[PDB]
Amino acid sequence: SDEFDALRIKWATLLTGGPALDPADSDIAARTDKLAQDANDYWEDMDLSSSRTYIWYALRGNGTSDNVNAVYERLRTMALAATTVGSSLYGNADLKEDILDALDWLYVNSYNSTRSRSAYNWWHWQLGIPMSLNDIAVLLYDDISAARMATYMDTIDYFTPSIGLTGAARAWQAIVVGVRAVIVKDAVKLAAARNGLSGTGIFPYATGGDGFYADGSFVQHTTFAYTGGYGSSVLETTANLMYLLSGSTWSVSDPNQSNVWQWIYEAYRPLLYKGAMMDMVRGREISRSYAQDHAVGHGIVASIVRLAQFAPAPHAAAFKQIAKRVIQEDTFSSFYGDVSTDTIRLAKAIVDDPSIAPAAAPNLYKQYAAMDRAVLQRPGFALGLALYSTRISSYESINSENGRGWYTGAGATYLYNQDLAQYSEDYWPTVDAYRIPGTTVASGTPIASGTGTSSWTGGVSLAGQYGASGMDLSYGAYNLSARKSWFMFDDEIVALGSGISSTAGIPIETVVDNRKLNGAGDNAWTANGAALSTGLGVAQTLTGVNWVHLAGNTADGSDIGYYFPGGATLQTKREARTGTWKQINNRPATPSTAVTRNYETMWIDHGTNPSGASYGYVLLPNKTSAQVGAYAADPAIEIVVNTSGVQSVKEKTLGLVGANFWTDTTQTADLITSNKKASVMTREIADERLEASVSDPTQANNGTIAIELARSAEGYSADPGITVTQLAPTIKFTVNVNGAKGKSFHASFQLG
Numbered sequence: 001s002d003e004f005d006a007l008r009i010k011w012a013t014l015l016t017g018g019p020a021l022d023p024a025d026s027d028i029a030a031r032t033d034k035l036a037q038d039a040n041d042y043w044e045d046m047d048l049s050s051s052r053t054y055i056w057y058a059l060r061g062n063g064t065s066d067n068v069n070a071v072y073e074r075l076r077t078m079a080l081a082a083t084t085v086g087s088s089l090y091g092n093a094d095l096k097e098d099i100l101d102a103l104d105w106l107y108v109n110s111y112n113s114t115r116s117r118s119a120y121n122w123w124h125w126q127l128g129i130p131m132s133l134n135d136i137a138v139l140l141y142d143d144i145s146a147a148r149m150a151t152y153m154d155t156i157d158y159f160t161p162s163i164g165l166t167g168a169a170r171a172w173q174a175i176v177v178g179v180r181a182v183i184v185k186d187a188v189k190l191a192a193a194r195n196g197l198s199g200t201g202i203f204p205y206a207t208g209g210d211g212f213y214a215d216g217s218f219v220q221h222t223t224f225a226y227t228g229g230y231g232s233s234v235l236e237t238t239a240n241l242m243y244l245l246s247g248s249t250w251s252v253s254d255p256n257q258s259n260v261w262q263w264i265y266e267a268y269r270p271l272l273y274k275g276a277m278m279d280m281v282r283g284r285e286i287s288r289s290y291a292q293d294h295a296v297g298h299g300i301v302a303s304i305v306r307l308a309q310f311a312p313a314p315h316a317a318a319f320k321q322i323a324k325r326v327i328q329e330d331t332f333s334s335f336y337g338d339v340s341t342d343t344i345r346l347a348k349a350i351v352d353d354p355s356i357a358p359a360a361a362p363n364l365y366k367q368y369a370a371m372d373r374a375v376l377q378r379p380g381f382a383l384g385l386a387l388y389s390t391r392i393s394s395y396e397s398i399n400s401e402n403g404r405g406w407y408t409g410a411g412a413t414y415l416y417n418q419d420l421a422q423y424s425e426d427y428w429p430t431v432d433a434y435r436i437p438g439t440t441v442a443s444g445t446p447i448a449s450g451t452g453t454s455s456w457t458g459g460v461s462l463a464g465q466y467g468a469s470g471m472d473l474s475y476g477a478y479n480l481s482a483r484k485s486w487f488m489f490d491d492e493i494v495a496l497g498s499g500i501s502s503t504a505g506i507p508i509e510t511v512v513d514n515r516k517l518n519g520a521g522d523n524a525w526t527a528n529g530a531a532l533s534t535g536l537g538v539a540q541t542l543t544g545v546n547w548v549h550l551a552g553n554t555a556d557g558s559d560i561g562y563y564f565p566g567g568a569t570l571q572t573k574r575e576a577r578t579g580t581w582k583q584i585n586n587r588p589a590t591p592s593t594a595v596t597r598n599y600e601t602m603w604i605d606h607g608t609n610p611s612g613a614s615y616g617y618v619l620l621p622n623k624t625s626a627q628v629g630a631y632a633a634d635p636a637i638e639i640v641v642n643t644s645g646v647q648s649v650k651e652k653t654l655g656l657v658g659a660n661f662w663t664d665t666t667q668t669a670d671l672i673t674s675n676k677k678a679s680v681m682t683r684e685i686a687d688e689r690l691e692a693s694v695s696d697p698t699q700a701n702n703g704t705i706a707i708e709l710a711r712s713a714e715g716y717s718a719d720p721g722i723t724v725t726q727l728a729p730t731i732k733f734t735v736n737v738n739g740a741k742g743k744s745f746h747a748s749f750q751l752g
């Protein structure tokens, strides 16, 4: 035996769970039964005639890459059922032969060197199919003749002989070349797969274009926030290949591999909430029924479990703690229910180890400047904010997927609480795509997929604890402008809108919220202390509203309060909406089955052709109706300013003042004065200190931002980049933002 045999067996275990796969495990037995179950269904529906024109009638079409890819996926599942200890199909000779005969037929009539490598969909021909075929070849290695293996492997080499792409594509090429190299025992190709991870979009941090960024962001296809979509793929592929190679002659040695650990801590951890990977970073994948947020989150945790198997200290331990936490957290969908058998084996080892304690939940405010995203994580809830600009596109829609993703990244707010199923359970095909929470739009009117013309999109982070974001709105599809800001405190998220103007001749509205309700659609809700009707199919306008409370889908932890400073007129409706995933994902594999979900939708009618309209509301997670009414009697936030020039909010209890300055002119908001476009947040601790953080969201100021704070200081300390010129009678300093790429600069002033 040689080292290649060792690697092949190591990969085989990654696929089957290995020989130690304990069948006495509830979730394992449950997964192995599901596996054998699916295998029999396929094997039973196979056309085994020697004159067949397809393997499965439903997937016929030797030239349809979608179907061909699915055919190989089914064969992979069947191979798994025949090689997974515990499966009732383990070692079945007939099943194995039927699979290999299927591969031979597919080789002669569909997947071979006579087909173009670039025919649609290239991804299937060069990456999808080879990944499935490689796995089958490893699983049934001992039953595959030299003649057969040659047709399988020679074909893969034709479609993908080398690694030359970037990001996820490059990572996929690497795993295709790598696993095949193990099968055929080519040390040259294997070393190439290893080196492949050092390339663009993988190990090295991106500073533009595709890849992981130092600030935690992940971009793919040049202008799309994609941590949970293509990012998840780069993570999974990288983790698997690194694990396969670890300890071997081809173990990864590139020092930049340490960046992978940071992906987990900075790119993923802040974007996961009780098992769900936030949709705002999943791109067009939000339109995939088989990839709803928790399904995606499980895959990410599966990768973390994989990394925990070979990562160096103290990362392996940390990853185990993170995985343990998320597994315990997800009471919506069992983590073990949709991950590989080996992942289950490895995960159970972590969960069952009493010496491993679940990691602490993330608690912070993070600005993902490189992908126009922001997140707030707190006990009991998380808020994700999705924006776009001249640097990041509104949404991606290709290959007939996500055709209604219009406003999913246009000032959209996503609130995560104990209703873990909020964005799953067919939310995407039923929600009104024209009314994404937090957005301002021309009613029932779409926008195009693309970057905007405004550079002011971003925000400021105050010591990674609190923050503020903003987006200068300007759609290309129709006339509509506005300044939109969000201020994130402890349990209050203040949304402000100003300068809302349009000549489009279409009613303009701002969506306060749009929440999926319970099955009966009877969630209790109140306004100004009075109970509101809970019936479905009812539209009603609320005038002079100070506050609204909406009971959640869970007994506790999912209520949401809404406070309206100065009062507001709210348009609302409660309805059952029906749709199909096919409507937002027009692919043959997509189910056309109708699904119905209930919603409570609330928005503000700015009218047609508004001029300088505005809005202001406060999201209050986890407060009872009584508590929202109490809040309204003494609101903890105060709107300092809400003009087209500056939007500012103060949270007296925390001593916080946030301010977004929209123009390059000297303006003042409370104690803060700025001479240019900037996002600023200060925290004052009476007679103790005054903290200040500043950023240039435009990422285009080649000089500085001059700030003046109306307080007298005794001394200071600050990030390099900040130059303090005065401490008394008032504080004055400049922030060098040349090439800052939207980062925040912090200073601490001693008061006195």
Ligand SMILES: C[C@]1(C(=O)O)OC[C@H]2O[C@@H](O)[C@@H](O)[C@@H](O)[C@@H]2O1
Binding pocket: 123, 128, 233
């Ligand atoms: C299996 C599948 C899919 O349909 O989900 O095939 C198409 C692939 O397209 C890539 O661009 C990724 O989205 C990648 O995730 C996709 O995987």
